[PDB]
Amino acid sequence: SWKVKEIVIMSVISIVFAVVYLLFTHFGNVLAGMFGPIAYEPIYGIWFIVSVIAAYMIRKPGAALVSEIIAALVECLLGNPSGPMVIVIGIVQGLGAEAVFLATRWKAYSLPVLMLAGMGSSVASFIYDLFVSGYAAYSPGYLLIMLVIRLISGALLAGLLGKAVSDSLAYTGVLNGMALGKELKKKRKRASEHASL
Ligand SMILES: Cc1ncc(C[n+]2csc(CCO)c2C)c(N)n1
């Protein structure tokens, strides 16, 4: 059962990373223009990181989905050049990540599950692009290479990097009200019990 503070902290994270998303979107446009779509595939997973952060921190159903929606909304508001369609891909990416936490009953937050969640967004956004972003015009080889790159980027820049960011925050103390903060507390109590006089 969600707490007010969790809903609130999830929003602040979404908002902050909306700014990051927008910066990378600008990069991606320049890259696409110069070298074609494959050029932004390596950084693609950054646009999923909010889902992993919110889920790993809060560990309740809907975190991955809602956090990404809010981040996409705010990125749109801040001036994403593609307008509201970024909110659609945001919804799609959030559903892709959420599906992995659904599949593991919102009880599993090991790195492999976080990476899978990232990859879920990779797959969902790739489906979206085949409908909307002109990907259907490309060859099997090009598409296959881009999907593979996007899958790796989702695993690394959302899953792994998302865990690293979250852990770093947990170490500041600011997540002490959250599941991840509680986990750190438990681990620290365990480690403290090794002290001897
Ligand atoms: C929240 C969010 N913001 C920006 C992107 C970037 N983006 C939207 S569409 C498109 C081209 C088709 O892949 C790219 C690079 C994203 N994926 N998710």
Pocket test for ligand 1, best of 25, 77, 93 (most atoms within 8 A of CB): 25
**162-170 long-range Cβ contacts below 8 angstroms, 24+ apart:** 162/48, 162/49, 162/51, 162/52, 162/53, 162/56, 162/114, 162/118, 163/52, 163/56, 163/111, 163/114, 165/49, 165/53, 166/52, 166/53, 166/56, 166/57, 169/57, 170/57
Give the number of the atom of ligand 1 that is nearest the alpha carbon of residue 21: 3
Buried b (16+ CB within 10 A) or exposed e, 95-109: bbbbbbbeeeebeeb
Domain coverage including residue 4: 1-197
Pocket test for ligand 1, best of 22, 40, 86, 91 (most atoms within 8 A of CB): 86
Q: How far apart are CA 17 and CA 14, in angstroms?
A: 5
Total structural domains within the chain: 1
Is 86's C-beta closer than 6 angstroms to any atom of ligand 1? yes
Is residue 11 helix, strand or coil?
helix
